């Protein structure tokens, strides 16, 4: 000698550790079939039998939450099976994780006879007609389902996935999941579907084979079958009937990718159009002038009002006015600058810092204790100068990265040593680290700050503090000699009395081949002086041959150059920010002792491989002064990426580059040839990469693209409303609409059967219904809508009012998205606006009355004089129902929230009296309605309320009475009724009718048309919201705080009645779309990236694909996907040829033009031979070069002639990060990739479309099928998210790579529970740094969805003792979050 507390041991060697091998987007969930084996093992205990000798049949199994497993942890769950009836729970405390009805039995329970099949039907088939375990679980991985070797049961399957071979290893949770995978494998797609309701599961172990013999290694495989007629996935002694799932937002396993623009930047004196030029916008120029005037007059007032003579450096102050007037009221100065500050015209500098401290240094009363007193006030607002547009113009992320990386390319060590002497006055770590150094992956860095004392602001940075006087040479610690590769001198070499002595000592600290970074004032030297004399104590700087220091510290920019040049310093970069400070990157000259060796690389046929190979072999045998110079005087040449890869195996101490771009070379092309003039200048600087482009020497650098630029809005003619993140109403934006191509996305599958006639109408007003709010806020997934909308771009908006193609005014309902600026409305759904309604009023009529007629006349069959009960009389559907019922001469009973709604309805309908209204707050209407109707009941009920109001409404139904239920938020039991066909689902019927537009719709169309003519259909009261307030409008609909219709105003109605709509553009976010009438060539599109991106193009509009591969279809994965595209309605064609000759190119474009005009050319072909450079012969060096040189050039040629030039829209050439960072062994691949990018850059020069993605590592599909160069591989769904941005952008080459960290690895100190949960809860929301976000912003404002709310609530229980409700996690901030744990 409740009913079962079951514990799952997730330990190192526990038998249930395999449950960790079942994840979904990194998170580890408890399988949906684990609640069946838990109820089946609890009924067996209840019946006193072994669980493997009991035959059960679970029905209507539901899953309400998801247990979140955890490595090395114990999770408990309580099952409870009701003895007689058979109702079971899997409760996990007070929260339900699953439910259903388990009912054991003895007779036969299995419906399908698969339990008798013995052998496998997938025998003797070719390998191209079969899917193996590698290919089956590549498809699941793409959708987020990550299964380990334990859950990888399906060992083989057919192309249609009907027949499979399932491994039987004796683990039932694993086995059942491998049978549920059959249902998953039968619904190809790209979204992540989470099972929620298994209608009928039948497990019969009596017919199942026995447990495998102990120690077995060759587990037997049972045949499996999928039955689409009945939706039964049967295998062995298991049968899972109809299952249902819900789309779930895919979560990013890693941190967001780092997008960059691989662009050329000049070294010295960049022009305003160059990327290394200081970002001095006209507004900043005005501020610089504005601050100059305020400083100057404040300088003069200082002189006059200093009657106490308590102003130090007064002689220096006087000199400032002398220079200020030479290089040229106080209240007006404040007025002008204050106007600049207080203005909010969009053109607004990030902050106005220099003025504020100048004001603080001028507004201070001139009394005793001035010098020391004011020193403290400004030292308190020192940050204002540091973060100030005027100063942060030579420290913009572009320039800082250029300095740090260009130094890194030339430093021939593994650790980059930096030294910022004088980090207390002018800090550079706060800019160098977050903007340039944190992105380093191939090279390590070691920052070291130094000043007189402790640098307080450097406490939080990964720098090393050092104590030594910076402004006193001859005492600099001798241990600093040859200690740094880079020496930063931000506002330091101006405060040393003898700068001639200053750098002489500094030049000894730099390593041989090191650099000096110098940032000093060089212009408008009277602007920053008011706040310099009063800080600096010994303002006694001595002059020199270059002149006399301005005031006593500064040297003019042209005189800084003279000093360094005189002392033997080569200017590497001299970016002369023209407003104030100027930059100087200097390196000591290199004097070679052996003649450098130049080798021409121009040839694209690699006729130079042998010469380069021999010299490269002689590198590590010569002087330290021997250098190999690979040169090239052509735009098309892969020297820049080729050298990067050679350095990865030979070191950067002997390899140099020179490339001259002929197209952009200036009037005087550099004549680099052995003993030349220009060449000798390069040898002295000794820069690893020298590129002559746009007329100046420079280098290629990856400039970061801010996260805000990915959502930058640009004008677009056709736009539509969608959500950036599902389930968020605050994420609604306007995207580019596919209607710019003429057609509408989603013409695949069912939508291809109904060939409706459509009219292209220009939307003027769009009405918002409660159907849109229910979809936007995540209350209902987009899968509940008719299946014709599955592939549509959006699902928001149905009704509208605008002008058809002829200029006539119209209104009507169309399949979504009608919340756009152009719609293709079927001609059978278009009414005409009578010439008395404004288009604003017509936007309120169509759906409200179409639903009202459907409910009353079409579904309830209302008759004259019948009684009707309408819920929510104040709603737009409710107001329409009252109007229609009144026209039918009925007795109306309505529910109103408050008295204001009653007042509105009585005024709107004078017929209604107070007797016809009730209260929606409590269920007292049932008594009143039954009494007032004398017990006969109501003939029709239009029901929207739920719970006890729904039951009460049904009980008022007459003997014939009809119940029309149009509520959206149905209960789980009600939803199962819809699935079971027990009840009809009428809440998405207007949507269903509009897709078909059959006899049932035409009845409503005629009804509403007659209603308009007879005066019953009248416009409703409305509130108009501008397009940009779309988010605000949606919230107002959801709140239901006031009665009325909400219509978004797209355009302005013209005074005429038949007039063309003017062409105008709307701000919108990018959304790439492909013309369905054009043919897209995907060269090498049968690979891993090509097949999964071709799917992406199909969803976005493409319907004519030509996939070319060297061999054609050769595997079961390729044959299955091609079959999927063709079934959808795509006109695919696989060509088994290689485009390496003109004839092959002609063939490809003969087939392409046969399908239709060419509208896209992609090249994802790749053959890679990895080996050591010195062990490559020519035949092996040009292996990758065929697909990346011999292919792109031929494709480029055909994309320049007619008719391809005019019709072509996209020209994508996939590249690799090897061109930007280099890699070991793939020297040939680097040469091929670099030439490919130089071809793409040429196209951009001629104005042709071009896009060159540069990926680092792609996870789900590709050659990876983990951490390379400290770079994580991207999930493919994220690749296509940034790929979309790449196409809709102006740059040519974009770099996308995911960084493991910026040092997190081996770095942490969390301890208190009050912080342990924060990182967990912060991680759940996808916030890498919890403290970064606001401590008062509600979680729903961040976009807290469900599953993400479930995890937070479950995480609190698992991590602490808190038990909260999901209703609070969406209104429960970070500050209140931290309070609960402590309590
Ligand atoms: N880790 C990654 O996945 C990365 C990918 N990239 C780029 O992505 C692109 C594709 O990646 P992936 O798809 O994984 O490469 P795969 O090797 O996965 O597939 C490459 C495809 O190229 C096709 N191909 C090769 N040569 C030719 C040719 N001469 N004519 C026609 N087709 C050809 C092959 O078809 P067959 O097999 O029939 O010859 C093969 O299916 C490549 O260009 C690569 O540079 C960039 C960075 C990293
Ligand atoms: P919101 O949309 O309210 O979230 C509802 C959720 C939590 C998703 C719930 O309805 C649900 O279905 N939870 C997940 C069920 C589950 O256990 N799935 C995992 C096993 S199946 C597998 C392939 O993931």
mmCIF file of N, CA and C and ligand atoms in Angstrom, residues 1083-1084 1086-1090 1108-1112 1137-1139 1163-1167 1186-1188 1191 1214-1216 1229 1255-1258 1261-1264, ligand 1:
data_model
loop_
_atom_site.group_PDB
_atom_site.id
_atom_site.type_symbol
_atom_site.label_atom_id
_atom_site.label_comp_id
_atom_site.label_asym_id
_atom_site.label_seq_id
_atom_site.Cartn_x
_atom_site.Cartn_y
_atom_site.Cartn_z
ATOM 1 N N UNK A 1083 21.451 32.039 -60.563
ATOM 2 C CA UNK A 1083 22.622 31.234 -60.880
ATOM 3 C C UNK A 1083 23.145 30.608 -59.596
ATOM 4 N N UNK A 1084 23.387 29.302 -59.632
ATOM 5 C CA UNK A 1084 23.750 28.604 -58.416
ATOM 6 C C UNK A 1084 22.672 28.626 -57.360
ATOM 7 N N UNK A 1086 20.496 26.446 -56.554
ATOM 8 C CA UNK A 1086 20.116 25.135 -56.046
ATOM 9 C C UNK A 1086 20.966 24.724 -54.847
ATOM 10 N N UNK A 1087 21.639 25.683 -54.220
ATOM 11 C CA UNK A 1087 22.445 25.397 -53.053
ATOM 12 C C UNK A 1087 21.635 25.488 -51.778
ATOM 13 N N UNK A 1088 22.302 25.732 -50.654
ATOM 14 C CA UNK A 1088 21.605 25.888 -49.396
ATOM 15 C C UNK A 1088 21.021 27.276 -49.246
ATOM 16 N N UNK A 1089 21.822 28.294 -49.561
ATOM 17 C CA UNK A 1089 21.327 29.665 -49.512
ATOM 18 C C UNK A 1089 20.345 29.931 -50.644
ATOM 19 N N UNK A 1090 20.607 29.364 -51.822
ATOM 20 C CA UNK A 1090 19.778 29.666 -52.977
ATOM 21 C C UNK A 1090 18.369 29.122 -52.856
ATOM 22 N N UNK A 1108 19.854 27.592 -62.007
ATOM 23 C CA UNK A 1108 20.893 26.924 -62.777
ATOM 24 C C UNK A 1108 21.919 26.320 -61.832
ATOM 25 N N UNK A 1109 22.238 25.046 -62.051
ATOM 26 C CA UNK A 1109 23.275 24.356 -61.301
ATOM 27 C C UNK A 1109 24.076 23.499 -62.268
ATOM 28 N N UNK A 1110 25.301 23.158 -61.864
ATOM 29 C CA UNK A 1110 26.162 22.363 -62.730
ATOM 30 C C UNK A 1110 25.556 21.003 -63.049
ATOM 31 N N UNK A 1111 24.735 20.456 -62.150
ATOM 32 C CA UNK A 1111 24.209 19.108 -62.304
ATOM 33 C C UNK A 1111 22.691 19.027 -62.269
ATOM 34 N N UNK A 1112 21.994 20.095 -61.893
ATOM 35 C CA UNK A 1112 20.551 20.046 -61.765
ATOM 36 C C UNK A 1112 20.119 19.509 -60.418
ATOM 37 N N UNK A 1137 23.489 23.457 -66.396
ATOM 38 C CA UNK A 1137 24.598 24.010 -67.157
ATOM 39 C C UNK A 1137 25.305 25.063 -66.318
ATOM 40 N N UNK A 1138 26.556 25.335 -66.681
ATOM 41 C CA UNK A 1138 27.389 26.314 -65.997
ATOM 42 C C UNK A 1138 27.622 27.503 -66.916
ATOM 43 N N UNK A 1139 27.361 28.702 -66.408
ATOM 44 C CA UNK A 1139 27.489 29.927 -67.215
ATOM 45 C C UNK A 1139 28.941 30.369 -67.085
ATOM 46 N N UNK A 1163 23.640 35.542 -58.269
ATOM 47 C CA UNK A 1163 24.757 34.605 -58.372
ATOM 48 C C UNK A 1163 25.154 34.185 -56.963
ATOM 49 N N UNK A 1164 24.811 32.953 -56.605
ATOM 50 C CA UNK A 1164 25.188 32.367 -55.329
ATOM 51 C C UNK A 1164 26.048 31.126 -55.520
ATOM 52 N N UNK A 1165 26.521 30.886 -56.740
ATOM 53 C CA UNK A 1165 27.400 29.763 -57.012
ATOM 54 C C UNK A 1165 28.704 29.910 -56.239
ATOM 55 N N UNK A 1166 29.249 28.773 -55.817
ATOM 56 C CA UNK A 1166 30.487 28.779 -55.050
ATOM 57 C C UNK A 1166 31.151 27.411 -55.066
ATOM 58 N N UNK A 1167 32.379 27.358 -55.571
ATOM 59 C CA UNK A 1167 33.240 26.190 -55.462
ATOM 60 C C UNK A 1167 34.501 26.636 -54.742
ATOM 61 N N UNK A 1186 35.870 30.631 -61.153
ATOM 62 C CA UNK A 1186 34.917 30.479 -62.248
ATOM 63 C C UNK A 1186 33.555 31.049 -61.869
ATOM 64 N N UNK A 1187 33.061 30.706 -60.679
ATOM 65 C CA UNK A 1187 31.730 31.147 -60.279
ATOM 66 C C UNK A 1187 31.716 32.613 -59.870
ATOM 67 N N UNK A 1188 32.877 33.185 -59.551
ATOM 68 C CA UNK A 1188 32.948 34.549 -59.049
ATOM 69 C C UNK A 1188 33.619 35.526 -60.004
ATOM 70 N N UNK A 1191 31.834 33.965 -64.128
ATOM 71 C CA UNK A 1191 30.378 33.994 -64.091
ATOM 72 C C UNK A 1191 29.828 35.411 -64.001
ATOM 73 N N UNK A 1214 26.435 37.610 -54.353
ATOM 74 C CA UNK A 1214 26.763 37.274 -52.976
ATOM 75 C C UNK A 1214 28.270 37.210 -52.782
ATOM 76 N N UNK A 1215 28.746 37.895 -51.744
ATOM 77 C CA UNK A 1215 30.166 37.918 -51.420
ATOM 78 C C UNK A 1215 30.386 37.333 -50.035
ATOM 79 N N UNK A 1216 31.622 37.381 -49.548
ATOM 80 C CA UNK A 1216 31.971 36.829 -48.249
ATOM 81 C C UNK A 1216 32.805 37.838 -47.478
ATOM 82 N N UNK A 1229 39.859 31.900 -52.949
ATOM 83 C CA UNK A 1229 38.505 32.385 -52.713
ATOM 84 C C UNK A 1229 38.500 33.886 -52.458
ATOM 85 N N UNK A 1255 28.389 38.280 -46.300
ATOM 86 C CA UNK A 1255 28.082 37.529 -45.093
ATOM 87 C C UNK A 1255 29.344 36.933 -44.487
ATOM 88 N N UNK A 1256 29.291 36.692 -43.178
ATOM 89 C CA UNK A 1256 30.376 36.021 -42.474
ATOM 90 C C UNK A 1256 30.108 34.523 -42.351
ATOM 91 N N UNK A 1257 28.984 34.158 -41.737
ATOM 92 C CA UNK A 1257 28.636 32.755 -41.550
ATOM 93 C C UNK A 1257 27.128 32.646 -41.395
ATOM 94 N N UNK A 1258 26.516 31.750 -42.167
ATOM 95 C CA UNK A 1258 25.076 31.527 -42.148
ATOM 96 C C UNK A 1258 24.818 30.172 -41.507
ATOM 97 N N UNK A 1261 21.532 26.898 -43.147
ATOM 98 C CA UNK A 1261 21.813 26.243 -44.420
ATOM 99 C C UNK A 1261 23.075 26.837 -45.025
ATOM 100 N N UNK A 1262 23.922 25.971 -45.576
ATOM 101 C CA UNK A 1262 25.125 26.415 -46.252
ATOM 102 C C UNK A 1262 26.326 25.540 -45.960
ATOM 103 N N UNK A 1263 27.524 26.080 -46.181
ATOM 104 C CA UNK A 1263 28.753 25.335 -45.947
ATOM 105 C C UNK A 1263 28.969 24.996 -44.478
ATOM 106 N N UNK A 1264 28.330 25.722 -43.559
ATOM 107 C CA UNK A 1264 28.398 25.378 -42.144
ATOM 108 C C UNK A 1264 27.695 24.065 -41.839
HETATM 109 N N1 LIG B 1 28.685 30.081 -44.801
HETATM 110 C C1 LIG B 1 27.985 30.471 -45.923
HETATM 111 O O1 LIG B 1 26.984 29.824 -46.249
HETATM 112 C C2 LIG B 1 28.489 31.622 -46.646
HETATM 113 C C3 LIG B 1 27.984 31.805 -47.886
HETATM 114 N N2 LIG B 1 28.393 32.860 -48.655
HETATM 115 C C4 LIG B 1 28.047 32.879 -50.076
HETATM 116 O O2 LIG B 1 26.778 32.298 -50.215
HETATM 117 C C5 LIG B 1 26.693 31.685 -51.499
HETATM 118 C C6 LIG B 1 26.026 30.341 -51.349
HETATM 119 O O3 LIG B 1 26.404 29.817 -50.146
HETATM 120 P P1 LIG B 1 26.032 28.105 -50.230
HETATM 121 O O4 LIG B 1 24.776 28.129 -51.004
HETATM 122 O O5 LIG B 1 26.107 27.743 -48.762
HETATM 123 O O6 LIG B 1 27.146 27.418 -51.116
HETATM 124 P P2 LIG B 1 26.706 25.856 -51.329
HETATM 125 O O7 LIG B 1 28.032 25.208 -51.522
HETATM 126 O O8 LIG B 1 25.836 25.512 -50.157
HETATM 127 O O9 LIG B 1 25.835 25.736 -52.708
HETATM 128 C C7 LIG B 1 26.632 26.332 -53.675
HETATM 129 C C8 LIG B 1 26.013 26.046 -55.014
HETATM 130 O O10 LIG B 1 26.780 26.621 -56.034
HETATM 131 C C9 LIG B 1 26.459 25.863 -57.174
HETATM 132 N N3 LIG B 1 27.487 26.101 -58.191
HETATM 133 C C10 LIG B 1 28.881 26.048 -58.052
HETATM 134 N N4 LIG B 1 29.542 26.318 -59.194
HETATM 135 C C11 LIG B 1 28.518 26.554 -60.121
HETATM 136 C C12 LIG B 1 28.545 26.884 -61.485
HETATM 137 N N5 LIG B 1 29.747 27.030 -62.141
HETATM 138 N N6 LIG B 1 27.397 27.069 -62.200
HETATM 139 C C13 LIG B 1 26.235 26.909 -61.476
HETATM 140 N N7 LIG B 1 26.044 26.600 -60.184
HETATM 141 C C14 LIG B 1 27.231 26.422 -59.512
HETATM 142 C C15 LIG B 1 26.437 24.360 -56.696
HETATM 143 O O11 LIG B 1 25.568 23.675 -57.425
HETATM 144 P P3 LIG B 1 26.176 21.996 -57.770
HETATM 145 O O12 LIG B 1 26.344 21.579 -56.342
HETATM 146 O O13 LIG B 1 24.963 21.494 -58.500
HETATM 147 O O14 LIG B 1 27.445 22.232 -58.593
HETATM 148 C C16 LIG B 1 26.013 24.520 -55.209
HETATM 149 O O15 LIG B 1 24.728 24.021 -55.048
HETATM 150 C C17 LIG B 1 28.140 31.433 -51.986
HETATM 151 O O16 LIG B 1 28.341 32.164 -53.148
HETATM 152 C C18 LIG B 1 29.016 31.958 -50.846
HETATM 153 O O17 LIG B 1 30.076 32.737 -51.297
HETATM 154 C C19 LIG B 1 29.126 33.902 -48.074
HETATM 155 C C20 LIG B 1 29.654 33.774 -46.855
HETATM 156 C C21 LIG B 1 29.499 32.536 -46.056
#
